[PDB]
């Protein structure tokens, strides 16, 4: 069954493969017909010499053209396969990337596909060429003697019987080989991505030992691979030898019986010696086909998997209010589906108003922020944006209308300009980028760099301090002019001077009338001017109201504030 | 140039000698066995042609099958041995490359990308693996049969064999140009593949941000645009290879024609007989094919090793680090001194960061370092941990330079909590006891209670045996920071560095952790922006624009 899945990828190029097959057949026939046109070479002078000269040149040119076409098509096939595998990977739900680590996914996408494509490219061409040669020899053999051709063709399935038995074992070995390679790659990636910490704790030897363990497992599998190779070679050669010997012996009985002359037998044997080599090559190809089937299991599982997240909608309204309503929302992470992180949240975000969400560590604030960004779906209740459920909006439009500053934000390895303008389809002008950088306070140090906004940044943002990374993330969120703005500890690493910028943005900027703001922080003095304060503990809202009301109640909020 | 790399590969393959010797022995047996099958094939086909005599027929056939059986066994053993040798060489290369990469200085990891390094570890070591077990085997098998075919030819017509050395079936000039271009295109292909892999690394590593900005399609387009260049390079290589093979085919045809003309001339003058001419032509066809095969194999073998030079460059790079230290005293007071320290990062040496700092830390006191963003506090913390070397001045630990202490000893006495800490995949226990060869569970529990981490560890699925996920992504920020604090407290350090270790902690928990030096035996450096926590300090250092203010 999986062989048809493998061969299905060639359905987009059938015309070019048909042309290649035609060229191969034509070259084989052009090379095959020479003896009939030039004799024994003992009958020889100029004409017979020039004839084979011309035929050899024509065959060489035809082979060149065929190889060019085939090698041109296979590169397109390989690139298309890799691109579609990556595209299918990126469509999966969020927890799929918690279950599968980065190194495993990278190894599956970049390494398995290359091996599959290379094996296909070599094996298909080899199979076609030797099949054509085998048929061209079979025709002459059938012309020589029908009876011996029949008694040869009758015994062919018995040779293929044995490889069909042990085919599954090659797949079951290759699966483990690829899995071990991916496991080693994950360790390598994780070790290299955090070198300062490993150096700080002097743990190079531990990482080396972790790598060595996976290498040992791979070493364990390779011995079985080699032994299987040797045994298969023995069996194939034995089958070929016996196939020659049986028919050769039968020919002796025929000639001794006086039924068939030796003249026919000599030619039939001389062509059997080559037909057997052809079928032996075709026998040798099959285990590599099973190996390739084994190598492609995980990428095809990626391709055929159905995402568990809902698909994107169609709504793209021109004007959006930004009103957000939570209605009895409950949530539990998929890997622990029996622990309710959130229980019955009910509140509303309204344009022009700032809502502060406070609570102890591990109470579920960032879970609410992730739910608001449609990264996860609630397991109970409803979450409505301007009266519509989140999935009904288009994927690109929704995340343009909702922007968030994540906790400990990430910065990609591009220029600062492209980092600020990340994710936008209509590329903004330099004036918009400069204004956005000025609002977040990043302009004061970006302009001091030797190349300004063209400065390159490493893949982890290592060339920036924590406050600078936070300012860049804030500008990246501000550039889109969102309707709902989410701040998740956006002031943890910002000094006292930069927090003034956030305060002006929240409570004094003239653009605040067009946004709904959800402020999550442990810096309690920042939320004193919030229109609503929600205290979240244990996944449930204990109390709410303005700062004065919560101070008067002398509840959890008052106890938290008064402690120092 | 490539000879040195080939010699290095030969030096590396020493642990595989007891298997390579058997591989070559089986190769010799198989090459001996293969030559004798056609003899008995001919001695059987003529028995079919002539009088039957069944006894002779059967006797010839039995020997035929016996020798075919022997050659088959030899070939199978040779193949198995060479495959195992290739696998061993590949694994050894990978292990050495990773162990060498782990030694490099921190500047090396900013000039390169992680995805590129991983794409050097994978799919690049295979080319270095294919050299000996694959290319040299076929090269030797071709050479040992070329010499035999020439030996057979010498008996027929020495004059014709001398004429056979006419320019050979190949031109040396074409081989040189093709070998020059092939290595270059292979190197370009490898670089393009690494650049393509980096895109997947970035896109999969930070997927939640991409989701939050809805930019998956942008990343897919970038990946496809990167794949296109690799496709073009592959086509450029393949077309040239095909053209070169066509040219060699034409050359072989021409040499064949000239040789047949000279053989016909020898026929016309009566110097040769037809059977000998036919045998000579058969041997000549074989030789003319095999010489071209040999030359092509040698060229490819050199080209792959030449193209794989980046891995050898990585394996040999000398770290930009001082000589390893040796000091490891039984007792350490913990006095730290900065003396006119000036520093600028190696990747940007024209912009100084520190401009002549000087201060002292003493046991039993808490010292606070404060300043605005970009003022160099984390740079001071990194310099104190010997992650970077100062460009001027000295850093002294108990009157010894910091770089003279043993690497494993130094990082057990000077421990720090980093800004935005990072955790590794695995259990909570393996993250708390990170970097320790042996640690008791009682110490782990005591360290967890010291950082107020038990009260949320007890709520996990398996307690301290629960997995935290990649980068600690299955934890809250405060929980991750508490685990980072416990990882430092479990070691009982003499000098403790807190690089804003309470940024994500809530108000209540921050109060219960200000007792950093209750026993009065540590040296504590506290880096903070909040003016609340600095009130407990005995010495306050204000850092602005890279200079200590008065």
């Amino acid at each position: 069954n999986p062989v048809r899945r493998l061969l299905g990828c060639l359905g987009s190029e059938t015309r070019r493969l048909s042309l290649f097959l035609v060229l191969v057949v034509l070259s084989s026939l052009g090379e095959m017909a020479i003896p009939f046109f030039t004799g024994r070479l003992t009958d020889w002078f100029t004409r017979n010499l020039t004839l084979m000269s011309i035929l050899t040149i024509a065959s060489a040119v035809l082979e060149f053209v065929g190889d060019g076409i085939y090698n041109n098509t296979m590169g397109h096939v390989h690139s298309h396969l890799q691109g579609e595998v990556f595209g299918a990977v990126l469509r999966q739900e969020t927890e799929f990337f918690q279950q599968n680590q980065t190194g495993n996914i990278m190894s599956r996408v970049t390494e398995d596909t290359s091996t599959l494509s290379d094996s296909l490219s070599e094996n298909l061409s080899l199979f076609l060429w030797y099949l054509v040669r085998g048929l061209c020899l079979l025709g002459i053999m059938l012309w020589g003697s029908v009876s011996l051709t029949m008694v040869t063709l009758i015994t062919l399935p018995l040779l293929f019987l044995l490889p069909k038995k042990v085919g599954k074992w090659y797949q079951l070995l290759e699966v483990q080989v690829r899995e071990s390679l991916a496991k080693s790659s994950q360790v390598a990636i994780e070790a290299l991505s955090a070198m300062p910490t490993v150096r700080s704790f002097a743990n190079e030897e531990g990482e080396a030992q972790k790598f060595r363990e996976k290498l040992q497992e791979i070493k364990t599998l390779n011995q079985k691979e080699a032994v299987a190779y040797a045994v298969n070679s023995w069996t194939t050669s034995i089958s070929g030898m016996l196939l020659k010997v049986g028919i050769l012996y039968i020919g002796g009985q025929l000639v001794t019986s006086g039924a068939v002359s030796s003249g026919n037998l000599v030619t039939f044997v001389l062509y059997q010696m080559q037909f057997t080599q052809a079928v032996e090559v075709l026998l040798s190809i099959y285990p590599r086909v099973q190996k390739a089937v084994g190598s492609s299991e995980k990428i095809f599982e990626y391709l055929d998997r159905t995402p568990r997240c809902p698909p994107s909608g169609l709504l793209t309204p021109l004007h959006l209010e930004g009103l957000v309503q939570f209605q009895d929302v409950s949530f539990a992470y998929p890997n622990r589906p029996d622990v309710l992180v959130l229980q019955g949240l009910t509140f509303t975000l309204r344009p022009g108003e700032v809502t502060a969400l406070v609570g102890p560590n591990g109470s579920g604030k960032s879970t609410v922020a992730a739910l608001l960004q449609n990264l996860y779906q609630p397991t109970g209740g409803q979450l409505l944006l301007d009266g519509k459920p989140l999935p009904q909006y288009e994927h690109r439009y929704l995340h343009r209308q909702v922007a968030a500053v994540g906790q400990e934000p990430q910065v990609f390895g591009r220029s600062l300009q492209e980092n600020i303008a990340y994710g936008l389809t209509q590329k903004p002008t330099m004036e918009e980028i400069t204004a956005a950088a000025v609002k977040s306070g990043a302009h004061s140090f970006i302009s001091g760099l030797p190349q300004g906004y063209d400065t390159e940044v490493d893949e982890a943002g290592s060339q920036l301090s924590g406050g600078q990374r936070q300012a860049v993330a804030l500008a990246r969120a501000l550039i889109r002019k969102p309707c709902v703005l989410i701040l998740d500890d956006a002031t943890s690493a910002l000094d006292a001077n930069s927090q003034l910028q956030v305060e002006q943005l929240l409570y004094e900027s003239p653009e605040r009338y067009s946004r709904s703001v959800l402020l999550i922080t442990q810096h309690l003095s920042l939320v004193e001017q919030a229109d609503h304060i929600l205290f979240l503990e244990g996944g449930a809202i204990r109390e709410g109201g303005t700062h004065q009301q919560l101070m008067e109640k002398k509840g959890c909020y008052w106890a938290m504030v008064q402690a120092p | 140039n490539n000879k040195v790399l080939m010699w290095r590969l030969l030096k590396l393959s020493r642990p595989d000698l007891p298997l390579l010797v058997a591989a070559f022995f089986f190769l010799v047996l198989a090459v001996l066995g293969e030559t004798l099958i056609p003899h008995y094939s001919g001695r059987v086909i003529d028995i079919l042609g002539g009088d039957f005599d069944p006894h002779a027929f059967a006797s010839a056939i039995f020997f035929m099958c016996l020798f075919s059986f022997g050659s088959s066994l030899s070939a199978g053993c040779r193949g198995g041995c060479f495959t195992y040798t290739m696998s061993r060489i590949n694994l050894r290369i990978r292990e050495q490359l990773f162990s060498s990469l782990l030694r490099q200085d921190l500047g090396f990891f900013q000039e390169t990308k992680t995805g590129e390094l991983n794409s050097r570890l994978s799919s690049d070591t295979t080319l270095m693996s294919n050299w000996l077990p694959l290319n040299a085997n076929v090269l030797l098998r071709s050479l040992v049969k070329v010499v035999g075919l020439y030996g057979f030819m010498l008996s027929i017509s020495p004059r014709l064999t001398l004429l056979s050395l006419l320019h050979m079936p190949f031109t040396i000039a074409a081989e040189k140009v093709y070998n020059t271009r092939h290595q270059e295109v292979l190197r370009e292909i490898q670089d393009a593949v690494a650049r393509a892999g980096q895109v997947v690394r970035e896109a999969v590593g930070g997927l939640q941000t991409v989701r939050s900005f809805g930019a998956e399609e942008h990343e897919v387009c970038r990946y496809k645009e990167a794949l296109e260049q690799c496709r073009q390079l592959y086509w450029r290589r393949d077309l040239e290879r095909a053209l070169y093979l066509l040219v060699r085919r034409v050359l072989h045809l021409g040499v064949q024609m000239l040789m047949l003309s000279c053989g016909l001339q020898q026929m016309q003058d009566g110097e040769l007989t037809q059977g000998s001419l036919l045998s000579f032509m058969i041997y000549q066809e074989s030789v003319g094919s095999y010489v071209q095969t040999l030359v092509y194999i040698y060229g490819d073998m050199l080209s792959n090793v030449g193209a794989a030079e980046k891995v050898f460059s990585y394996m040999d790079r000398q770290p930009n680090l001082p000589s390893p230290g040796t000091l490891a005293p039984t007792t350490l007071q913990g006095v730290v001194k900065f003396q006119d320290v000036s520093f600028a990062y190696p990747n940007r040496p024209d912009r100084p960061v520190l401009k002549g700092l000087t201060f002292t830390l003493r046991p039993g006191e808490v010292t606070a370092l404060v300043g605005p963003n970009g003022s160099g506090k984390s740079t001071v913390a990194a310099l104190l941990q010997n992650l970077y070397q100062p460009t001027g001045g000295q850093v002294l630990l108990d009157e010894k330079p910091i770089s003279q202490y043993e690497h494993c000893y130094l990082h057990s006495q000077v421990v720090s909590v980093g800004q935005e800490p990072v955790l590794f995949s695995g259990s909570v226990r393996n993250n708390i006891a990170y970097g320790l060869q042996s640690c008791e569970d009682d110490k782990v529990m005591a360290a967890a209670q010291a950082a107020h981490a038990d009260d949320f560890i007890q709520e996990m699925e398996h307690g301290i045996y629960t997995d935290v996920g990649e980068k600690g992504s299955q934890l809250a920020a405060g929980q991750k920071q508490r685990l980072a604090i416990a990882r430092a407290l479990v070691r009982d350090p003499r000098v403790l560095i807190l690089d804003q270790a309470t940024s994500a902690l809530d108000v209540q928990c921050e109060q219960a952790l200000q007792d950093w030096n209750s026993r009065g035996d540590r040296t504590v450096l506290v880096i903070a922006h909040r003016l609340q926590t600095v009130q407990r300090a005995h010495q306050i250092l204000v850092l602005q624009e890279g200079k200590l203010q008065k």
Partner: peptide
């Protein structure tokens, strides 16, 4: 006619043999 030329026969044999050298060198190991 029907008859086989030994020279062309081995030419065919060598063509069948060397297909695996310039392409799929892995199979010859």
């Amino acid at each position: 006619r029907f008859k086989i030329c030994p020279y062309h026969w081995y030419k065919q044999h060598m063509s069948l043999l060397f297909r695996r050298y310039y392409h799929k060198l892995d199979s010859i190991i």
